[PDB]
């Protein structure tokens, strides 16, 4: 049943850190979870004997030596953990062998938008989450399948998002675009508008100079905007966004704040406006009245100027002729 090298217990087959290339033939029929992490497993290592008699639903294959997307996997597998590898391409035939997949973890690889096959995720209308963090990516794939709820494209090299890339992904709950080359013109017109059941959008550490517009208000609870060169907030940026509970605006050079930008925000409870001083006084007279808001309780880690401190009295610090 179980090999000399690999040892199993009640379905869970632990063939990890053993340091070998091929998957051992000694794979039991009543399989639950296939552990194959921290090994030397290459692309030829995976044999044909990994379907037809495999009851597996979760296969872990991180810290391995395989190139390309894995081939010959049990049809009813839901979790495909493929991390810290040199997977370049994701073809139709390779993905097609596992139709009932729920979670595809491609964190730390080399999958580019050019490297991913056109219409690979076509017959993949069962995927709940796809992680493509730190890959050779340049654009949001676009050929991405429906029923996706978690798409993490963080710490990549993605520069541009097109309108039909996220158009149709709607069912999506959380979009994580962190540490990327997304500029304001790099961020497509009315790009997120379409994503109705989106609870979380993360744009942390990018290249956008002004807080996005045409953002979903329909169901968006969180919006993470930090480590960007945001100076000007467009009036219609935080408009029709009622359902927003958390907004993060820290580590952003907001020199100004327009009169009644947060008006359309009602559910708002947590705000993070810290790490940007010298900004107070003129035009921000409304903040003094606003931050002192009606019930319920108030929570905001706001901003306050450095050179001035209290508008009361007269400055007269200018003494030159």
């Amino acid at each position: 049943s179980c090999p000399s090298v690999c040892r199993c217990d009640a379905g869970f087959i632990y063939c990890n850190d053993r340091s070998l290339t091929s998957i051992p033939v000694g794979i039991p029929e009543d399989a639950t979870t296939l552990y194959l992490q921290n090994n030397q497993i290459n692309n030829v290592g995976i044999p044909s004997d990994l379907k037809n008699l495999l009851k597996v639903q979760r296969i872990y294959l991180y810290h391995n030596s395989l190139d390309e997307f894995p081939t010959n996997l049990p049809k009813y597998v839901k979790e495909l953990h493929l991390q810290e590898n040199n997977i370049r391409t994701i073809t139709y035939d390779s993905l097609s062998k596992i139709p009932y997949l729920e979670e595809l973890h491609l964190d730390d690889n080399s999958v580019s938008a050019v490297s991913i096959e056109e219409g690979a995720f076509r017959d993949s209308n069962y995927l709940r989450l796809l992680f493509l963090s730190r890959n050779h990516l340049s654009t949001i794939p676009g050929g991405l399948p429906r029923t996706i709820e978690e798409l993490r494209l963080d710490d990549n090299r993605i520069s541009t998002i097109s309108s039909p890339s996220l158009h149709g992904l709607t069912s999506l709950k959380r979009l994580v675009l962190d540490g990327n080359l997304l500029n304001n013109h790099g961020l497509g017109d009315k790009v997120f508008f379409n994503l109705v059941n989106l609870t979380e959008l993360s744009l942390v550490r990018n290249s956008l100079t002004a807080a996005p517009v045409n953002l979903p208000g329909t169901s968006l609870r969180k919006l993470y905007l930090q480590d960007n060169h945001i100076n000007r907030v467009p009036p219609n940026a935080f408009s029709y966004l009622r359902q927003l509970y958390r907004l993060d605006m820290s580590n952003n050079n907001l020199s100004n704040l327009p009169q009644g930008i947060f008006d359309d925000l009602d559910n708002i409870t947590q705000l993070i406006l810290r790490n940007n001083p010298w900004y107070c006084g003129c035009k921000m007279k409304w903040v003094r009245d606003w931050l002192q808001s009606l019930p319920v309780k108030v929570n905001v880690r706001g901003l306050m100027c450095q050179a001035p401190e209290k508008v009361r009295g007269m400055a007269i610090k200018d003494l030159s002729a």
């Binding site: 040892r7 217990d9 632990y14 850190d17 992490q37 872990y60 991180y62 953990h81």
Partner: protein, 267 residues
């Protein structure tokens, strides 16, 4: 350091705090801080990256938080502890323990737990990436994990809370996936067995104990409470001699009664 209260014999639920919006997670205090602060990190698969801190139980119930600690990496499971102002936790998809200095917001260290199984490989009965459990007692810092040399069988380790280094490793002959949760008191492993959500009355008690000092281990039957049928995390405190249990959403404290501390030898 801290004085040993004796051998644990009776576990009784004495305090009932609030109910979480998460079925799993961990909540604990710092036994080296004279302040009555509370640290709460609810489990959210692949999304656990923030530790919440509370000043009092009143604030902890009403959901009034003191501050939030965003962590430079994702956390795996409900293992975490808070010792001398620095939290220790299992960094996600690794066998590393990360010392993180709170109220300085800096990674002071990172300890590679040699040959440890991680990421739902050797977890508790409920899984949830609870492969490595940090532990604070009278003898200090601990790591309750498991190696595939043992193959599922729990492996405990003394861990320097200041230099983050393994100060000993003891192999136990009891499965981890069988364990619902485990903890340390006077360097003694108390391993909790409880029913979950076929789901027959397997048992609701600590059935095994391993003694670090002397390396001896025996079978027990210490009646452990599982009223909510899903034990998420159990963390002992040597300062107030209490268990800081999380159970199927229920955030609760479990009181202890201690008997005479005894150890027999014959190698």
């Amino acid at each position: 350091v801290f004085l040993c209260p004796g051998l644990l014999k009776g576990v009784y639920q004495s305090e009932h705090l609030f109910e979480s919006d998460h079925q799993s997670g961990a909540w604990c205090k710092d036994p080296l801080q004279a302040s009555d602060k509370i640290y709460y990190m609810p489990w959210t698969p692949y999304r656990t990256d923030t530790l919440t801190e509370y000043s009092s139980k009143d604030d902890f119930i009403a959901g009034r938080p003191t501050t939030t600690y965003k962590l430079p990496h994702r956390v795996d499971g409900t293992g975490f502890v808070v010792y001398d102002g620095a939290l220790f936790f299992n960094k996600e998809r690794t066998r590393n323990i990360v010392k993180f200095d709170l109220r300085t917001r800096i990674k002071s260290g990172e300890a590679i737990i040699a040959n440890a199984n991680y990421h739902d490989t050797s977890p508790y009965r409920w899984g949830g990436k609870s492969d490595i459990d940090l532990a604070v007692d009278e003898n200090g810092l601990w790591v309750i994990y498991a190696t595939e040399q043992n193959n599922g069988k729990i492996v405990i380790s003394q861990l320097n809370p200041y230099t983050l280094r393994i100060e000993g490793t003891w192999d136990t002959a009891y499965d981890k996936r069988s364990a619902s949760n485990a903890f340390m008191i006077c360097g003694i492993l108390y391993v909790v067995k409880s029913v979950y959500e076929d789901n027959e009355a397997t048992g609701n008690k600590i059935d095994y104990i391993y003694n670090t000092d002397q390396s001896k281990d025996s079978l027990v039957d210490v009646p452990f409470p599982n009223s909510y049928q899903y034990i998420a995390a159990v963390d002992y405190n040597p300062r107030d001699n209490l268990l800081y249990v999380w159970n199927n959403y229920h955030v609760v404290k479990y009181s202890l009664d201690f008997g005479p501390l005894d150890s027999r030898s014959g190698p």
